[PDB]
């Protein structure tokens, strides 16, 4: 096979399991023969899942102050664009937070060493994280054999996807709204470098003029 651009060579190992699979592999990065380092078939499927569900938080995160501002639910002072929040102080920074964005960045540093490195030592050592004392909260962190899908009693709160056959759908649907959303973050970023506006403003301006307001009539002729 599906999703043209595939090949016979990237179809031997790439069978139909390992969900999100559609056979699209022109270059053949994931390949279980002779692999090593970060082009391992396990690290690449894992990093795709992680790149998916960070992007879809950002894809619903870059669009949300602008949509809720047009709907009037948030005040106009927080109706800023996603690059004008302090992520890029060259592009503009909101000055009304509860701290300097270097205070909040160090709170981000601490909270993401404790989040990401616990997240990494279950990739390396899969049975870990439910071994040493971590506030009694280590009973969550047993995970499973697969690193991208831990499924503890917190990360699978509502125990959704009970059977195996129902689980392959939701694992597919996560990547399907992930590979859309990774493209959406690329279609937020590159579309804001060129235009200089928000994503929802570019949605409104394309519904207003479909022809005279698109990629073509935006090179500032």
């Amino acid at each position: 096979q599906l999703y043209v651009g595939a090949s016979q060579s990237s179809l031997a190992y790439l069978d139909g399991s390992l969900p999100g699979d559609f056979g699209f592999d022109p270059l053949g990065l994931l390949d279980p023969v002779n692999s090593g380092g970060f082009i391992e078939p396990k690290w690449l499927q894992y990093s795709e899942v992680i790149h998916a569900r960070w992007a879809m938080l950002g894809a619903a995160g870059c669009i949300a102050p602008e949509v809720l501002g047009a709907a009037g639910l948030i005040p106009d002072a927080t109706n800023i664009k996603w690059f004008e929040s302090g992520v890029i102080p060259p592009a503009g920074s909101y000055n009304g937070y509860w701290a300097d964005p270097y205070t909040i960045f160090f709170v981000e540093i601490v909270a993401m060493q404790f989040a990401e490195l616990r997240r990494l030592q279950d990739f390396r050592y899969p049975g870990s994280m439910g071994q040493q004392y971590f506030l009694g909260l280590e009973a969550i962190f047993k995970g499973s054999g697969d690193a991208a899908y831990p499924g503890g009693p917190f990360f699978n709160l509502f125990n959704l996807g009970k059977t195996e056959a129902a689980m392959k759908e939701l694992k597919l649907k996560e990547i399907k709204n992930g590979r859309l959303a990774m493209l959406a973050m690329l279609g937020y970023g590159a579309q804001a470098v060129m235009t200089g506006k928000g994503p929802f403003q570019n949605l409104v301006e394309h519904l207003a003029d479909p022809v005279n307001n698109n990629i073509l009539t935006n090179f500032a002729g």
Binding site: S7, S9, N34, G37, A91, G221
Partner: protein, 312 residues
């Protein structure tokens, strides 16, 4: 995929055990000295990788990670010259009067009377008058401040440790197989397109967006602390349209093939810039653009994984 990534996981244990035994690479040297010709043959046969082993794969892994060692030493060497360009120089003073102030970037320590080597190079400064011409690179790069030289010196130390990591990784942890190196079609498609082609595309983009508006303001005559910083030359298109009035047309004349409308800052002047004696920078900008389009085209010559392309 005949052209594919192929490495071997952990060929060599990262261990200091073989540093204890000099001459470990060769049979003739590992039994210790009995003669001072041992320690000369140690340094002579050290990088003779073809003579250590017979395996061409083991030779190839040794010359691949040694090249990261040479690149890692060049990144130390470059980062020295930007650092000695930053903290011990007169590059601040040189840009204001680059006719009388002699370029100097080495300063010696006053101990045995060797401080007399700190000449009167001008610019309120004493030091060895250098001749390697880095200050002429840096005005061509539009550096204009010793902050920029310090940040790219720290960027040189970071890049050198990345290169030392890479030779360590691609030898000890994950070293390539032999048929990885024997894809000379894939190497030339990547080196003509990516290294030479995209390199001169990227440097032209540095010359369009940074060096041209900085050196136009230096030739028109502006003190270097008054020139806009080059990130302001990116975020504000209205500044660029003041110097070259065709940035107001955006990147529309490129895609509409109205390339003659870019004639302000991609030129074919030739000769020399009479204000500064050097080549015209807009001339060198259209140079590295047309160099890049040439090599990216030539970088799609050889056949790797689809039937198009030549086979050597």
């Amino acid at each position: 995929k005949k052209v594919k990534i192929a490495v071997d996981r952990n060929p060599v244990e990262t261990s200091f055990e073989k540093w204890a035994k000099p001459g470990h690479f060769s049979r003739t040297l590992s039994k210790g000295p009995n003669t001072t010709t041992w320690i000369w043959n140690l340094h002579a046969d050290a990088h003779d990788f073809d003579s250590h082993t017979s395996d061409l794969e083991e030779i190839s892994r040794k010359v691949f990670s040694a090249h990261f060692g040479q690149l890692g030493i060049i990144f130390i060497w470059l980062s020295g010259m930007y650092f000695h360009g930053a903290r011990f120089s007169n590059y601040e003073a040189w840009l204001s009067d680059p006719t009388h102030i002699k370029p100097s970037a080495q300063v010696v320590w006053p101990i045995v009377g060797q401080e007399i080597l700190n000449g009167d190079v001008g610019g309120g400064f004493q030091g060895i008058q250098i001749t390697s011409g880095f200050f002429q690179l840096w005005r061509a790069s539009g550096i204009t401040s010793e902050l920029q030289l310090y940040t790219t010196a720290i960027g040189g130390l970071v890049m050198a440790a990345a290169m030392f990591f890479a030779g360590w990784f691609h030898y000890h942890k994950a070293a390539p197989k032999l048929e990885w190196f024997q894809n000379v079609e894939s190497m030339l498609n990547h080196h003509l397109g990516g290294l030479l082609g995209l390199g001169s595309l990227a440097w032209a983009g540095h010359q369009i967006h940074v060096s041209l508006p900085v050196n136009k303001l230096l030739d028109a005559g502006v003190d270097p602390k008054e020139i806009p910083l080059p990130h302001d030359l990116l975020l504000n298109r209205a500044i660029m349209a003041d110097l070259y009035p065709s940035f107001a047309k955006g990147i529309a004349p490129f895609f509409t093939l109205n390339w003659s409308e870019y004639s302000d800052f991609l030129t074919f002047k030739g000769g020399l810039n009479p204000v500064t004696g050097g080549l015209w920078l807009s001339d060198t900008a259209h140079h590295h653009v047309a160099i890049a389009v040439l090599f990216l085209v030539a970088g799609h010559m050889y056949r790797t994984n689809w039937g198009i392309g030549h086979s050597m």
